[PDB]
Design a protein around this ligand. Structure first.
Ligand SMILES: [Zn+2]
Ligand SMILES: [Zn+2]
Length: 102
DNA sequence: GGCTCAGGGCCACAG
DNA sequence: CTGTGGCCCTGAGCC
């Protein structure tokens, strides 16, 4: 029921410090791990919408970092255990954000 | 020690 | 062929 603060897709859960989808997760890795770097000709921060998120990769990347996606969470190495020192924040934020009881 | 919780890899389908 | 977006498996984490 929640949408990504960047691309706007349905979130699959907590990824990189935010409620994000596999599109964010996958693209974020594809960008950061492969050391990709882009640049927008004008307006480095365009309107990141469902269509315009495809035309501006740089703006989408900037959007990710801006909305709060951890760049340090990108284990470009290989180790699937990409839980760094900010690992606790996931369950912490989740417990505060939801705080729903059992 | 075990169940959870989230991330990285490779995939399959869409441009 | 290239790429978005995803499901899957492994791994850090916490209970
Ligand atoms: Zn997303
Ligand atoms: Zn742009």
């Amino acid at each position: 029921d929640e949408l990504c603060p960047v691309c706007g897709d349905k979130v699959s859960g907590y990824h990189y410090g935010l409620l994000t989808c596999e599109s964010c997760k996958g693209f974020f890795k594809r960008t950061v791990q492969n050391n990709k770097h882009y640049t927008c000709t004008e307006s480095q921060s365009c309107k990141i919408d469902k269509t315009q998120r495809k035309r501006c990769p740089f703006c989408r990347f900037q959007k990710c970092l801006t909305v709060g996606m951890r760049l340090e969470a990108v284990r470009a190495d290989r180790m699937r255990g990409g839980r760094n020192k900010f690992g606790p924040m996931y369950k912490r934020d989740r417990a505060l954000k939801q705080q729903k009881k059992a």
